[PDB]
Design a binder for this molecule. Structure first.
Ligand SMILES: [Zn+2]
Ligand SMILES: [Zn+2]
Ligand SMILES: [Zn+2]
Ligand SMILES: [Zn+2]
Ligand SMILES: [Zn+2]
Ligand SMILES: [Zn+2]
Ligand SMILES: [Zn+2]
Ligand SMILES: [Zn+2]
Ligand SMILES: [Zn+2]
Ligand SMILES: [Zn+2]
Ligand SMILES: [Zn+2]
Ligand SMILES: [Zn+2]
Ligand SMILES: [Zn+2]
Ligand SMILES: [Zn+2]
Ligand SMILES: [Zn+2]
Ligand SMILES: [Zn+2]
Ligand SMILES: [Zn+2]
Lengths: 128, 128
């Protein structure tokens, strides 16, 4: 299936990030790190002009939950979200936790990933 | 179809991170951010006692290359590496770039990911 979940939002980059942080907070997720990919590359004189910001988010209890079931899940932490502007429109997307964890061949872990995916998806929908 | 590439090292957690940072640098990869999952969870009072540190690394030129091939690859950036200890032995692992982008059904992108994967794995091998 589609490896990612992406939504179109009416707001610009800055306000989208603002609203996403509030939506995540409502769900117990905190932003651990924000990285402006576009800035990092353009500062190096590289040719990449699409505005794009990557956010590493985390809900401590959810992290502990998955790590205590399978240590290798750390290879997919923290949860990643990406806010970018394509064709003059802003979007928020994320690789699906169930697709990432699915590669691990751990049925039970994938079901916990599904809970996480549902919550992150809800956070994204609130930003439409 | 192992989703990850992991190596055992003889060094302790801190020395290992130091050696990995150097190995990465020699290959043009800089550490953008890192954090101790263990400290974070224990700080929150949760039960997780396995030493584990996650590093987000970047080689700007390589990032520009995949992003310009397919924007959605941003959903898998920056490159992730994990240093952790199991049964008293330190290990360094990474989810395979080829496995991650493989879900995108994009042969051209996967070829670039294979190039990046080989280089990152070399960095890991050099810490043994
Ligand atoms: Zn603006
Ligand atoms: Zn505002
Ligand atoms: Zn903000
Ligand atoms: Zn700037
Ligand atoms: Zn900069
Ligand atoms: Zn989490
Ligand atoms: Zn259990
Ligand atoms: Zn939950
Ligand atoms: Zn629900
Ligand atoms: Zn929805
Ligand atoms: Zn395995
Ligand atoms: Zn250091
Ligand atoms: Zn460092
Ligand atoms: Zn080399
Ligand atoms: Zn890179
Ligand atoms: Zn190549
Ligand atoms: Zn090359």
């Amino acid at each position: 299936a589609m490896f990612h979940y992406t939504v179109d939002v009416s707001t610009g980059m800055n306000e989208t990030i603002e609203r996403l942080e509030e939506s995540l907070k409502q769900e117990g997720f905190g932003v651990l790190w924000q990285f402006s990919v576009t800035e990092k590359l353009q500062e190096k004189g590289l040719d990449f002009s699409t505005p794009m910001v990557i956010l590493e988010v985390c809900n401590p209890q959810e992290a502990a939950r998955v790590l205590n079931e399978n240590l290798l899940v750390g290879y997919f932490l923290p949860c990643k979200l990406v806010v970018y502007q394509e064709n003059g429109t802003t979007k928020i997307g994320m690789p699906k936790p169930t697709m990432l964890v699915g590669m691990m061949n751990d049925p039970a872990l994938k079901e916990i990933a599904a809970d996480i995916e549902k919550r992150l998806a809800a956070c994204l929908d609130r930003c439409r």
